[PDB]
Amino acid sequence: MFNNWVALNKKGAIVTGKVTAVDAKGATVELADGVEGYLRASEASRDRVEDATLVLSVGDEVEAKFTGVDRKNRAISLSVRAKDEADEK
């Protein structure tokens, strides 16, 4: 995914990942070439409770915000939303 990309492609952008594996608080979403980003417990929707939450499954993809990368793991952290930091600021 991103591991190659850091040289061509920068953070603050939106990337689509696919649901596939779980963390205790988490979903590790498949972002390709082996590596995963982050997906939150809400899954997606559009607003609140269930929207899209009934029609996206494990192996199906949603658009998340490209937040930051951890230097030690050499991978990307995704926040599920699209914009994230555009609520009031």
Backbone as a printed PyTorch tensor [residue, N CA C, xyz], in Angstrom:
tensor([[[  0.8420,  -1.2220,   0.0000],
         [  0.0000,   0.0000,   0.0000],
         [  0.8470,   1.2290,   0.0000]],

        [[  0.7040,   1.9850,   1.1090],
         [  1.3620,   3.1580,   1.6140],
         [  2.8850,   3.0560,   1.7530]],

        [[  3.4540,   1.8710,   2.1180],
         [  4.8570,   1.6120,   2.4640],
         [  5.8830,   2.1220,   1.3920]],

        [[  5.4910,   1.9140,   0.1010],
         [  6.0070,   2.3010,  -1.2150],
         [  5.7170,   3.7580,  -1.6030]],

        [[  4.4670,   4.1390,  -1.2930],
         [  3.6710,   5.3080,  -1.5600],
         [  4.1230,   6.6010,  -0.9260]],

        [[  4.7240,   6.5930,   0.3100],
         [  5.1790,   7.7520,   1.1370],
         [  6.0370,   8.7840,   0.3720]],

        [[  6.7880,   8.2540,  -0.6220],
         [  7.6110,   8.9210,  -1.6080],
         [  6.8220,   9.6490,  -2.7240]],

        [[  5.6850,   9.0630,  -3.2020],
         [  4.7540,   9.6050,  -4.1920],
         [  3.4900,  10.3210,  -3.6670]],

        [[  2.8860,   9.7650,  -2.5840],
         [  1.5680,  10.0450,  -2.0210],
         [  1.6060,  10.3960,  -0.5240]],

        [[  0.9800,  11.5460,  -0.1790],
         [  0.9240,  12.1770,   1.1330],
         [ -0.4140,  12.0770,   1.8660]],

        [[ -0.3430,  12.2040,   3.2210],
         [ -1.3660,  12.2330,   4.2750],
         [ -2.3240,  13.4320,   4.2180]],

        [[ -3.6170,  13.2380,   4.6210],
         [ -4.6970,  14.2410,   4.5270],
         [ -5.7010,  13.9740,   3.4390]],

        [[ -5.3980,  12.9150,   2.6760],
         [ -6.0790,  12.3440,   1.5290],
         [ -6.9980,  11.2580,   2.0220]],

        [[ -7.8590,  10.7010,   1.1570],
         [ -8.8500,   9.6680,   1.4910],
         [ -8.5830,   8.3730,   0.7560]],

        [[ -8.6530,   7.1880,   1.4290],
         [ -8.2070,   5.9500,   0.8060],
         [ -9.2830,   4.9710,   1.1540]],

        [[ -9.5820,   4.0160,   0.2410],
         [-10.5920,   2.9980,   0.4520],
         [ -9.9560,   1.7250,   0.9270]],

        [[-10.4720,   1.1890,   2.0460],
         [-10.0010,  -0.0990,   2.5530],
         [-11.1310,  -1.0260,   2.7650]],

        [[-10.7700,  -2.3290,   2.8290],
         [-11.6960,  -3.4470,   2.9950],
         [-11.6520,  -4.1770,   4.2870]],

        [[-12.8390,  -4.3970,   4.9250],
         [-12.9630,  -5.0270,   6.2650],
         [-12.5080,  -6.4780,   6.2520]],

        [[-11.7470,  -6.9720,   7.2460],
         [-11.1710,  -8.3190,   7.1020],
         [-10.7210,  -9.0160,   8.3880]],

        [[-10.2690,  -8.2720,   9.4420],
         [ -9.6520,  -8.8330,  10.6390],
         [ -9.9140,  -7.8980,  11.7880]],

        [[ -9.9250,  -8.4140,  13.0430],
         [-10.2800,  -7.6060,  14.2230],
         [ -9.2010,  -7.3980,  15.2970]],

        [[ -9.2400,  -6.1820,  15.9260],
         [ -8.4770,  -5.7200,  17.0810],
         [ -9.4630,  -5.7230,  18.2290]],

        [[ -9.0460,  -5.5500,  19.5110],
         [ -9.9410,  -5.5400,  20.6880],
         [-11.0260,  -4.4400,  20.6820]],

        [[-10.6150,  -3.2370,  20.2280],
         [-11.3850,  -2.0290,  19.9670],
         [-11.5420,  -1.7860,  18.4560]],

        [[-10.9800,  -2.7050,  17.6220],
         [-10.5930,  -2.4070,  16.2630],
         [-11.0620,  -3.3240,  15.2060]],

        [[-10.8330,  -2.8260,  13.9850],
         [-10.9240,  -3.5140,  12.7350],
         [ -9.6660,  -3.0830,  12.0230]],

        [[ -8.9380,  -4.0770,  11.4670],
         [ -7.7580,  -3.8790,  10.6320],
         [ -8.2830,  -4.1670,   9.2320]],

        [[ -8.2660,  -3.0970,   8.4170],
         [ -8.9260,  -2.9710,   7.1280],
         [ -7.8530,  -3.1420,   6.0780]],

        [[ -8.0970,  -3.9760,   5.0250],
         [ -7.1350,  -4.3590,   4.0010],
         [ -7.0300,  -3.3410,   2.8930]],

        [[ -5.7690,  -2.8800,   2.7440],
         [ -5.3710,  -1.7010,   2.0260],
         [ -4.3510,  -2.0210,   0.9220]],

        [[ -4.0430,  -3.3340,   0.7610],
         [ -3.2870,  -3.9700,  -0.3150],
         [ -1.7740,  -3.8990,  -0.3500]],

        [[ -1.2110,  -4.9310,  -1.0420],
         [  0.2050,  -5.2990,  -1.1530],
         [  0.6780,  -5.9180,   0.1650]],

        [[ -0.3110,  -6.4610,   0.9240],
         [ -0.1370,  -7.1250,   2.2110],
         [ -0.5750,  -6.3120,   3.3980]],

        [[ -0.3360,  -4.9750,   3.4180],
         [ -0.5540,  -4.1320,   4.5970],
         [ -1.9500,  -3.5150,   4.7610]],

        [[ -2.3510,  -3.3840,   6.0460],
         [ -3.6200,  -2.8970,   6.5610],
         [ -3.5350,  -1.5270,   7.1750]],

        [[ -4.6740,  -0.7810,   7.1970],
         [ -4.7740,   0.5130,   7.9000],
         [ -5.6470,   0.3590,   9.1350]],

        [[ -6.5330,   1.3270,   9.4750],
         [ -7.3980,   1.2670,  10.6530],
         [ -8.8580,   1.5210,  10.3050]],

        [[ -9.7670,   0.7360,  10.9090],
         [-11.1930,   0.9420,  10.7800],
         [-11.7880,   0.8510,  12.1840]],

        [[-12.6320,   1.8520,  12.5400],
         [-13.3590,   2.0280,  13.7900],
         [-14.6360,   1.1870,  13.8580]],

        [[-15.1020,   0.8920,  15.1020],
         [-16.2640,   0.0830,  15.5030],
         [-17.6340,   0.4110,  14.8760]],

        [[-17.8330,   1.6830,  14.4290],
         [-18.9760,   2.2430,  13.7030],
         [-19.1470,   1.7120,  12.2700]],

        [[-18.0770,   1.1140,  11.6620],
         [-18.0170,   0.5060,  10.3220],
         [-18.0170,   1.4840,   9.1410]],

        [[-19.0200,   2.3900,   9.1170],
         [-19.2040,   3.5000,   8.2050],
         [-20.5280,   4.1730,   8.5300]],

        [[-21.6430,   3.7820,   7.8400],
         [-23.0010,   4.3850,   7.9140],
         [-23.0950,   5.5080,   6.8670]],

        [[-23.2040,   6.7680,   7.3420],
         [-23.3720,   8.0190,   6.6260],
         [-23.6090,   9.0930,   7.6740]],

        [[-24.3310,   8.7600,   8.7770],
         [-24.6370,   9.7070,   9.8470],
         [-24.4490,   9.0630,  11.2190]],

        [[-25.4380,   8.2790,  11.7050],
         [-25.3900,   7.6580,  13.0160],
         [-26.2560,   6.4190,  12.9850]],

        [[-26.0000,   5.4830,  13.9440],
         [-26.5610,   4.1670,  14.2270],
         [-26.2470,   3.1860,  13.1210]],

        [[-27.2600,   2.8660,  12.3160],
         [-27.0800,   2.0720,  11.1120],
         [-27.4850,   2.9720,   9.9250]],

        [[-26.6420,   3.1270,   8.8630],
         [-26.9380,   3.6440,   7.5390],
         [-26.5150,   2.4820,   6.7100]],

        [[-25.4400,   2.6830,   5.9390],
         [-24.6280,   1.6820,   5.2460],
         [-24.1530,   0.4450,   6.0640]],

        [[-24.2700,   0.4200,   7.4340],
         [-23.7920,  -0.5750,   8.4070],
         [-24.3770,  -1.9780,   8.2070]],

        [[-25.5840,  -2.0660,   7.6010],
         [-26.2460,  -3.2830,   7.1520],
         [-25.7680,  -3.8200,   5.7930]],

        [[-25.1370,  -2.9680,   4.9410],
         [-24.7520,  -3.2690,   3.5610],
         [-23.2980,  -3.1480,   3.2800]],

        [[-22.4890,  -3.1480,   4.3560],
         [-21.1030,  -3.4280,   4.1430],
         [-20.7940,  -4.4430,   5.2240]],

        [[-20.1290,  -5.4460,   4.6780],
         [-19.6340,  -6.7190,   5.1570],
         [-18.1310,  -6.7690,   5.2080]],

        [[-17.6020,  -7.7790,   5.9410],
         [-16.1990,  -8.2140,   5.9380],
         [-15.7930,  -8.6960,   4.5090]],

        [[-14.7440,  -8.0710,   3.9270],
         [-14.2740,  -8.1520,   2.5470],
         [-14.7660,  -7.0280,   1.6600]],

        [[-15.6430,  -6.1060,   2.1640],
         [-16.1970,  -4.9770,   1.4370],
         [-15.5570,  -3.7250,   1.9940]],

        [[-15.4110,  -2.7050,   1.1110],
         [-14.6690,  -1.4850,   1.3420],
         [-15.4280,  -0.1860,   1.5490]],

        [[-14.7940,   0.7450,   2.3060],
         [-15.2870,   2.0770,   2.6480],
         [-14.1150,   3.0340,   2.5610]],

        [[-14.3880,   4.3600,   2.4330],
         [-13.4070,   5.4400,   2.3210],
         [-13.1150,   6.0770,   3.6610]],

        [[-11.8270,   6.1930,   4.0140],
         [-11.3870,   6.6400,   5.3250],
         [-10.3710,   7.6650,   5.0040]],

        [[ -9.9430,   8.3840,   6.0240],
         [ -9.1100,   9.5610,   5.9360],
         [ -7.7230,   9.0730,   6.2130]],

        [[ -6.7010,   9.6020,   5.4920],
         [ -5.3240,   9.1110,   5.6120],
         [ -4.6850,  10.0680,   6.6110]],

        [[ -4.5620,   9.5500,   7.8760],
         [ -4.2680,  10.3450,   9.0750],
         [ -2.7980,  10.5900,   9.3140]],

        [[ -2.0860,   9.4800,   9.6140],
         [ -0.6740,   9.4370,   9.9600],
         [ -0.1600,   8.0250,   9.8810]],

        [[  1.1850,   7.8640,   9.8880],
         [  1.9380,   6.6070,   9.8070],
         [  2.8150,   6.5020,  11.0250]],

        [[  2.9520,   5.2660,  11.5550],
         [  3.8570,   4.9460,  12.6390],
         [  5.1410,   4.4470,  11.9950]],

        [[  6.2880,   5.0430,  12.3950],
         [  7.6290,   4.8590,  11.8500],
         [  8.2510,   3.4870,  12.0680]],

        [[  7.8960,   2.8550,  13.2160],
         [  8.3340,   1.5480,  13.6820],
         [  7.6090,   0.3890,  13.0060]],

        [[  6.3330,   0.6010,  12.5780],
         [  5.5140,  -0.4330,  11.9530],
         [  5.4400,  -0.2580,  10.4410]],

        [[  5.8730,   0.9470,   9.9540],
         [  5.9680,   1.4740,   8.5850],
         [  4.6770,   1.4550,   7.7420]],

        [[  3.5300,   1.6390,   8.4360],
         [  2.1830,   1.5800,   7.9960],
         [  1.4210,   2.7700,   8.5380]],

        [[  0.2580,   2.9450,   7.8970],
         [ -0.8010,   3.9520,   7.9230],
         [ -1.9580,   3.6160,   8.8450]],

        [[ -2.4420,   4.6730,   9.5260],
         [ -3.5800,   4.7480,  10.4100],
         [ -4.6360,   5.5570,   9.6580]],

        [[ -5.8130,   4.9450,   9.5040],
         [ -6.9730,   5.4650,   8.8110],
         [ -8.0470,   5.7590,   9.8310]],

        [[ -8.6840,   6.9470,   9.7410],
         [ -9.8740,   7.2860,  10.5310],
         [-11.0220,   7.2110,   9.5230]],

        [[-12.0780,   6.4130,   9.7170],
         [-13.1410,   5.9570,   8.7870],
         [-13.9760,   6.8330,   7.8470]],

        [[-13.9230,   8.1150,   8.1740],
         [-14.8750,   9.1900,   7.9310],
         [-14.9260,   9.9070,   6.5980]],

        [[-13.7300,  10.2190,   6.0360],
         [-13.4390,  11.0490,   4.8720],
         [-12.6380,  12.2690,   5.3270]],

        [[-13.2460,  13.2720,   6.0120],
         [-12.5620,  14.5080,   6.4070],
         [-11.9640,  14.4850,   7.8070]],

        [[-12.7530,  14.0600,   8.8340],
         [-12.3760,  13.9580,  10.2520],
         [-12.2730,  15.3090,  10.9670]],

        [[-11.2250,  16.1130,  10.6530],
         [-10.9420,  17.4290,  11.2190],
         [-11.6250,  18.5630,  10.4440]],

        [[-12.9680,  18.4750,  10.3140],
         [-13.7950,  19.4610,   9.6370],
         [-15.1750,  19.4100,  10.2590]],

        [[-15.2140,  19.6790,  11.5860],
         [-16.4130,  19.6540,  12.4200],
         [-16.6750,  20.9740,  13.1450]],

        [[-15.6750,  21.8890,  13.1850],
         [-15.7120,  23.1790,  13.8750],
         [-14.2940,  23.7040,  13.8400]],

        [[-13.3550,  22.7620,  14.1330],
         [-11.9120,  22.9020,  14.2260],
         [-11.5080,  23.5050,  15.5860]]])
